[PDB]
Scaffold this active site. Structure first.
Site, short mmCIF file in Angstrom:
data_model
loop_
_atom_site.label_atom_id
_atom_site.label_comp_id
_atom_site.label_asym_id
_atom_site.label_seq_id
_atom_site.Cartn_x
_atom_site.Cartn_y
_atom_site.Cartn_z
N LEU A 76 0.86 -1.22 0.00
CA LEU A 76 0.00 0.00 0.00
C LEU A 76 0.88 1.25 0.00
CD1 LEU A 76 -2.45 -1.79 0.38
CD2 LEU A 76 -3.22 -0.23 2.19
N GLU A 132 11.20 7.08 10.52
CA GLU A 132 12.32 6.10 10.63
C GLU A 132 13.38 6.43 9.58
OE1 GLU A 132 10.72 2.20 9.91
OE2 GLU A 132 8.90 2.66 11.06
N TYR A 181 12.82 5.46 3.60
CA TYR A 181 12.61 6.55 2.60
C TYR A 181 13.73 6.55 1.54
CZ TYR A 181 8.11 7.97 4.34
OH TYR A 181 6.75 7.99 4.55
N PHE A 210 7.05 19.22 9.11
CA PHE A 210 5.71 19.04 8.49
C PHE A 210 5.50 17.53 8.29
CE2 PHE A 210 8.87 19.88 5.28
CZ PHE A 210 8.66 18.90 4.34
C1 LIG Z 1 4.99 11.92 12.59
C2 LIG Z 1 3.81 12.43 11.75
N1 LIG Z 1 3.53 13.84 11.99
C3 LIG Z 1 2.10 14.12 12.23
C4 LIG Z 1 1.27 14.25 10.95
C5 LIG Z 1 4.04 14.60 10.87
C6 LIG Z 1 4.00 16.07 11.22
N2 LIG Z 1 5.00 16.47 12.19
C7 LIG Z 1 4.97 17.83 12.72
O1 LIG Z 1 5.82 18.11 13.49
C8 LIG Z 1 3.93 18.89 12.33
S1 LIG Z 1 2.24 18.55 12.95
C9 LIG Z 1 1.14 18.27 11.53
N3 LIG Z 1 1.71 18.24 10.32
C10 LIG Z 1 1.00 18.04 9.24
N4 LIG Z 1 1.64 18.02 7.94
C11 LIG Z 1 -0.40 17.85 9.37
C12 LIG Z 1 -1.34 17.61 8.21
C13 LIG Z 1 -2.67 17.48 8.74
S2 LIG Z 1 -2.59 17.64 10.43
C14 LIG Z 1 -0.96 17.88 10.64
N5 LIG Z 1 -0.17 18.10 11.70
C15 LIG Z 1 -3.67 17.24 7.61
C16 LIG Z 1 -2.87 17.68 6.37
C17 LIG Z 1 -1.40 17.47 6.71
#
Ligand SMILES: CCN(CC)CCNC(=O)CSc1nc(N)c2c3c(sc2n1)CCC3
Ligand SMILES: CCN(CC)CCNC(=O)CSc1nc(N)c2c3c(sc2n1)CCC3
Ligand SMILES: CCN(CC)CCNC(=O)CSc1nc(N)c2c3c(sc2n1)CCC3
Ligand SMILES: CCN(CC)CCNC(=O)CSc1nc(N)c2c3c(sc2n1)CCC3
Lengths: 396, 396, 396, 396
Positions: D90, D116, D120, D396
C-alpha cells in the site's frame, strides 16, 4: 533605568517578569491575595526608559521570636531582575531602596526565603531556621511503649475534608504560631489560598486529606507520580499528645510505603518509634533568613535563657554600630558605646544567632564571629539558645 | 545449646559465622589485630551440642566524655547468630552474659555501632552520637572573606603518601581524641590496619592520599565507580586554622566535582563558604550507642556546663536504681535514695543524653523521659549539653 | 617557589602529584615508556623551598598536516599543580617557560589533549580536531547494495589475538598516519603499551580482540559492566574496502546489541547502512588542540585547496605578528609587513583553522576572526579546508 | 483495495488512522489549518472495498536553496498504512501515485521529515539537513572578550509575550527564510498554530516566553518534568549581533541549570563562550529529506561556489537519466547526453548533496557515489558546498 514605586498600570509587566523568573508562580488571580499584605510604598520596580526589568517588595508579617515575643517583620519577596538586564547592579539598587524604607517605617527585622544559598549573605541576611525532611518506611514502624495514646478505647483523631474544618485549623495554627520561634501570623487571604490547593487539579496534584485532633492537624496528599508516598504538607500540634496521635494515624495509612514531611531538626518523631533509624533524614536546607534592621531594638525585644547568670560585654556589628550588651534574668539591655569591642560579627551572623538555630561556638570556629574570650562564647551560646525549638512557619 | 568462652579451636567456626553474617568482613589475617583488643573472657560462643551458631565479644576501649574525661569502655562487637538458629533467644542470652562480665570487671559504660536501628534499644543502648554526610559541589565553592588562611604567602598543607607520615597522623589523632567527646584511643594495631587500606586493591578501592598540616590531616580516595567524587575517609583537626587549611586543599582538587565526608552536625565547613547551601547534608544516622553500666559512676565521671547554677533532683532509671542527683560547678554527686522520683527514664535514654548529642526537651516530648517540672527539664538540657561538640571516633 | 628542570631524584614526587591529579594514571612502570619521548629540558617542576607542587613537560611528536606534510610537534602533557598551591600562577609560569623552550628548539607547532574546555584558550591553543562517538544498534543493521565487499566467496578479514600480529598493525598504522591530517608517528614503546592493555586485567577491562585486513585493523573489547556493548578502541583503514570489510565483521558480532567507536565527523559508516540513523551520534568533543608557535613557518608548511584560485591578503595575529599571506597552487608564502591588516584573529583561532576542522565563516560569526570583506572569508574557508578529512591519532 | 483522491466524507476516517498512527497528532481542529496547504489532488487514500487503511498527501511549500533561490516543493506528509494492512505494498502504491502527480504538476523537488531512517531511501529521498541538539550548563557559561555586545549601556533584547509580537516574529522569520538554505515560507495558518502552542495547557506544556531583538527572536519554555532545563523551541537571527544578544539573554536565565536547543552543525554558539565544551552536543539526526523530481531543473536552479573554476562532466542518476553537467561562475547547465558517464549515483544521493549538507568525498567513500577521477570528486565537493550553512526550517 530609573527606580520607582509601581502604578496599577505596572503590575501586568511585573506578573510577566514573575512568570518568567519563578516556575512555582500560581498566576495573577492568586496574586490578588498576597498583594493585600504589601503596604503602600512596599514595592519597587525598574522600568527601561516601557517594560519592567526589575522588581522587589516586602509584606507586613508578624514573626514570633524566643520569649513568645511577636515582632513586626518586613518579609522580602517577588525579587526578580529580567534575564535581559543581569550583572547591571539592579538588585544592589532595589534591595538598598527597600532596606531604607523598611528601616524608616520602624521594622526591627526583615526576613526572606532564599532561591539560592549565595545571593543573600552580602545584603546582611543570615540563615535563621533549618528545614529537615524526614521519610518514614511506615511498614516497619512500631511505636515505643513510652509513647502517649497507645492504650485501649477510642482515637481522638478524625479523617476530614480540609475545606469543612477551616475554623479548627485556624484556631490551632493561631495557638501554635504564638508559642513557637519562627511562627508567622497567617492572615485570612492565605487560608483562602492554602484551601484552594487542598482540592485536586486536572493532571496536577491529588486531593488533600486532613487528620484533625483537638490540639493538632496534619494536611497530606499522595505524591503525583509515586503513589506509595504520602507527602505531609503541614503538621501543627500544640501538645505532645496531639503530635503522637497524628503520627499514629499517618503510620496507619496502610496503602502507603513512605510518609515524608518537611520539619525541624528537633522533631521528636524519631524517638516515638522502637527504631529511631526508620525516620531517615533525606534532605536539609536553610529555611527562613533574617536581616536585623535595628540591633538594639531586636536584641532587647527577645527573651534569653534564665539558666545562664547575668553577664556583660561589648558587641560590634560591621557597619552596624557597637553596643554594650548586658544579659540577665532572660532580658537584655543594648546601649551605644565606643568602649573596646569584645565580639565582632557581620550583620548576617547576628541574623543566624537570633532565633537560636545556630550556636556561636560553630560560627566562631568558621571565624564568622571573632572574640578572644571563650568563656564569653560559652555564655553567648547558652543565652541565645531557645528553650522551645525554632521552626519554619510558611514560605513567602 | 550451651554458652561458653571460646577455645583457640573455636575461632575458625567464628570466622565462618563472621563471613556469612557480615559482608564488610576483611578475613582472618585482619582479625589477628582486633583480637589483641579482646580481653580474656571478653568473648562468648554458642555451640550446637560441633559448630558455632552464636558469638558476641567486647574490646577494651578508652572513650573521651565531656570534661576531657576518659572512661574505660567495653566495646561490643562481632555479635552474630547463625541463620539456622534465629528467634531462639541466643542473642538475649549472649548479651546478658557479656553485660554480667562487663559489669563485674568494673567498666562504667559499654558502647557499640548498630547494624539495625531497632535491635539495641531493648538491651539498654541509646544512640549517643550522630553521623552526618556533607557533599560539596566544589566547582561553585568560594571561601568567605572571614575564613582563616585566605591571604598571600605559602600553604601550610602538604600532599603526601599516608604510609610515610604514620608518626604525624598518630600525634594529631592522639591530640584530637583527648579533647573531643566520642574520642577513642586508637592502638598501634588499628593504625597498621588503617594504613593497609590506604594502598589500592586489584579491582577494589583506589589509592588513598593524605593532606598533612602541623595540627590536622585528611585521608581521601576517589570513589570506585564515580570518578568525579572524592571520599574523605577521615579528617582530624586540632585547630580552626588546620580545619580551614585542609578544606581549601580539598576544594582545590580541580579534577573532582564533589567532595563527600561523614562528619558531625556541628561541622563548621558550611560557614566557611560564601554559600552555606553548597555543603548539602545527603545522609544522617545514629553513630556510637552507649549503655550506662553503673549510673552513679558514669554521671559523676563526666563534666557539666558551668553556665547553669547549682541544682538538685531525684533521677529514677527503670530497673537501674534511683539517685539523688546534685549538679554544680560542672561536677555531679550521685547517691542512693528512696525519696519520690522527679525524673524517670529507661537506661537507653540516659545513654543518648550522656555525650550531649540529644536534648532532654526532645526525649521528654516523645515521653521517653517523664518529669512534672519543666524548669528541671530546662536545667538537665543546659547541664548535660557539651561545650565542645560530640563526634564519632571510628567504627568497631 | 622556584621553577627548575627535574633531576632523577624529582620523578618520585612528580609520580605522586600524577597519581593525585590524574585518575587514568597507569603508574611508574608504564611512565618509563612515555619518559623516552620527553627530550632533555622538555620538563619543568616547581618545588616548595622539598616536594613537587607543579610540573609540565612536552614530548617530541610528528604531526601529519594537510598536504601529507609531517611537522615536528611539541606535545604538552603531564601538566599538574598541587591542590595545596591553586590560584598561585604556577600554571601561567610553567606554560610560559615550556613555550620559550619549545620556540627556541625550533618546533613550529605545539599540541595537547584538554582535561577541561576552558583552561587552554588563553595560552593560544585552539581545538583543531573533533571526536565523535557513533553507537550502532547492530541488530537492525543491514548494509546498502552499493557497499563494497557484499558478494559471494571468502571474507578478507580474520579474527586474531592482537599480540601475535603487532607487525601488521604497525605497517597499517604507519601507512594511515602519513596520509591523514591529525596523524601521529607512534613509536615502538607506545605499541608495547597499547598491547599490554590488550590483555584482560583482574576485575578490570576484558580481553581485546582484533579484526585484521590486508589494509586495515580494528581493536575491540566488550564493556566491563554492559556485556551487550562492544567498544572499538581503535579502527585504522587505508582503503574504503578495508573500512567496509571491518564493519561487516563488527556488525557480525551477533552476541552484541551495540558497537560504539570514537571516530571523526566525516566517518562514512552511516552511509554504508540502508538506514543512516542506526549509527546514532551519542557524544562529541574537541580532540587535539594546536598552538601555532611560528605563524610563517606553519602557514607555509601545509598544503591548501588547488580548487580556489590564487589570492593575497594581510593576516594579523594578536601579539603574534602581521603577515602578507599569498595563496595559490595549494602553496602559501607568508612574509612580514606593516601594511593595513585585512584579517585579525587570536593565536588559538589560527590553531582551530590549521587542520581544516573549523570553517572561518563559523569563527567569524562568533567575532573570533574579524574581517570587513566576505569574499576573503569565502576564500579562507575554501583554501584552509582539507581534501582528506581530519582525524585524532591517539591521546597523550 | 482501490487507490482514490479523498472526498470530504473520507476525512473522519483519515483522522482516525492519524490518531492511531501518530502520537504527536493535535486533532481535527488543528488539521483545518494544515489542510489549507494541501492542493486539490494532493492526497490519496486506500479504502477496503468502507474505512481508510492507507493515506498519503503533499503540501505546497517554498524551499530556499543555495544562491537564495526559492523552489516550489511538494512536502510529503500524513503518510500512514493501517496496522491491519501492513506488508501489502500500500505504501509502494500510494508514494508512486503522489510522485506521478508531483512530477506532472511541475514541482522540481519533493521533501519530507522521516519517522524512521530506513523507509525513505528506496523511494529516492536523501537526508539533506542535520539537526544537532546543544545543551549549555549556563552556570559555568562566560562569554569570550571577542563576542559582540559585551560592553556598557542598555540591552537591545526584550522579554515579551509571543502573542503580542506576532508581526515582528513574522518580519524576522521572512527575512531569515529567504537567505538560508533549508528555509521554508511559513504561511499565516502555521503562525496561528505556533502561537496556540505558546499558551500553557492543563497538565501539559508550560507557558512560552520570547526574547525579541530588532533582527532576531527566541521562543523558549521550561521543560514539563525537569524544571531546571529551558527548551528553546525556535531561535531565528538575521545578524551575528542578534544571535549573540539573544544567547546573552538565555544564559541570563539564572533560575535554570541547562538551556537545550535543536540547531545546525555550524551553530556559532560554542565559539561565543570562553569554554567551547560547555555547549555539549547531546543529540544528532537527519532533518529534512529531499527527492530530486527533475534533475536538470533542480541542478540548474541552485547557485554553486564561485571559488572553484569552470569544469564539465557527465552525471548518471540510476533510472533518472544521464546529463552533461557544466559548472562555472556559480551557475550550472544540465543537458541530455548518451556520452560515457563519469559519475554515477542513486537519486537519494543527489538529494543529500543538493543543500550542501553532505560532502561527495564522504558518500564516495561509502561507494554511494561512483567515479574513477578524484580531481572531479574534489570539484563536486567544492562546487556543491553552501557558502551560508544549511538549516532545518520547521517539521511538516
Ligand atoms: C509523525 C507524523 N507527523 C504528524 C502528521 C508529521 C508532522 N510532524 C509535525 O511536526 C507537524 S504537525 C502536523 N503536520 C501536518 N503536515 C499535518 C497535516 C494534517 S494535520 C498535521 N499536523 C492534515 C494535512 C497534513
Ligand atoms: C521563588 C519565588 N516565589 C514566588 C514568588 C516566592 C514565593 N514562594 C512561595 O512559596 C509562596 S507563593 C507567592 N508568594 C508571594 N510572596 C507572592 C507575592 C505575589 S504572588 C505570590 N506568590 C505578589 C505580592 C507578593
Ligand atoms: C557489621 C559488623 N562489623 C564487622 C565485624 C563490625 C565492625 N565494623 C567496622 O567497621 C570495623 S571492622 C572489624 N571490627 C571488629 N571489631 C573486628 C573484630 C574481629 S575482626 C573485626 N573487624 C575479631 C574481634 C573483633
Ligand atoms: C589526563 C592526564 N593524562 C595522564 C597523564 C594525560 C594522558 N592521557 C592519555 O590518554 C595517555 S596516558 C599517559 N600519557 C602521558 N603523556 C604520560 C607521560 C608520563 S606517564 C603518561 N601516561 C611521563 C611523561 C609523560
Amino acid at each position: 533605568v530609573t527606580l520607582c514605586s509601581p502604578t496599577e498600570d505596572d503590575w501586568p509587566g511585573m506578573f510577566l517578569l514573575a512568570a518568567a523568573s519563578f516556575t512555582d508562580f500560581i498566576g495573577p488571580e492568586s496574586a490578588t491575595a498576597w498583594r493585600t499584605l504589601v503596604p503602600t510604598d512596599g514595592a519597587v520596580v525598574v522600568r527601561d526608559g516601557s517594560e519592567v526589568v526589575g522588581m522587589a517588595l516586602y509584606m507586613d508579617l508578624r514573626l514570633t521570636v524566643p520569649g513568645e515575643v511577636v515582632l513586626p517583620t518586613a518579609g522580602l519577596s517577588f525579587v526578580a531582575v529580567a534575564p535581559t538586564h543581569r550583572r547591571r547592579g539592579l538588585l544592589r539598587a532595589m534591595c538598598a531602596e527597600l532596606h531604607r524604607r523598611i528601616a524608616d517605617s520602624g521594622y526591627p527585622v526583615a526576613a526572606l526565603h532564599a532561591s539560592e544559598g549565595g545571593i543573600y549573605g552580602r545584603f546582611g541576611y543570615g540563615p535563621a531556621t533549618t528545614l529537615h525532611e524526614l521519610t518514614v518506611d511506615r511498614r516497619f514502624a512500631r511505636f515505643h511503649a513510652d509513647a502517649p495514646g497507645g492504650g485501649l478505647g477510642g482515637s481522638s483523631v478524625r479523617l476530614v475534608r480540609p475545606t469543612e474544618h477551616r475554623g479548627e485549623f485556624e484556631a490551632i495554627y493561631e495557638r501554635w504560631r504564638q508559642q513557637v520561634p519562627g511562627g508567622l501570623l497567617r492572615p485570612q487571604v492565605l487560608w483562602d489560598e492554602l484551601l484552594a490547593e487542598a482540592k485536586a487539579a486536572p493532571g496536577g496534584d491529588r486531593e488533600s486529606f486532613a487528620l484533625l485532633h483537638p490540639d493538632g492537624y496534619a494536611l497530606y496528599r499522595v505524591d503525583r507520580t509515586d503513589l506509595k508516598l504520602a507527602r505531609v504538607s503541614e503538621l501543627r500540634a500544640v501538645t505532645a499528645d496531639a503530635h503522637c496521635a497524628l503520627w499514629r494515624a499517618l503510620i496507619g495509612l496502610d496503602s502507603m510505603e513512605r510518609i515524608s514531611i518537611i520539619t525541624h531538626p528537633q522533631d521528636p518523631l524519631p524517638h516515638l518509634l522502637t527504631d529511631t533509624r526508620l525516620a531517615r533524614t533525606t534532605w536539609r536546607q536553610d529555611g527562613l533568613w533574617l536581616r536585623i534592621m535595628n540591633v538594639p531594638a531586636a536584641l532587647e525585644a527577645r527573651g534569653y535563657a534564665h539558666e545562664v547568670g547575668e553577664f556583660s560585654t561589648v558587641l560590634e556589628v560591621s557597619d552596624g554600630g557597637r553596643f554594650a550588651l548586658k544579659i540577665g534574668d532572660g532580658r537584655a539591655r543594648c546601649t551605644p558605646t565606643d568602649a573596646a569591642a569584645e565580639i565582632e560579627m557581620d550583620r548576617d551572623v547576628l541574623g543566624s544567632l537570633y532565633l537560636g538555630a545556630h550556636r556561636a561556638s560553630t560560627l566562631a570556629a568558621a571565624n564568622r564571629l571573632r572574640t578572644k574570650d571563650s568563656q564569653l562564647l560559652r555564655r553567648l551560646d547558652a543565652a541565645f539558645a531557645s528553650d522551645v525549638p525554632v521552626q519554619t512557619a510558611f514560605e513567602f
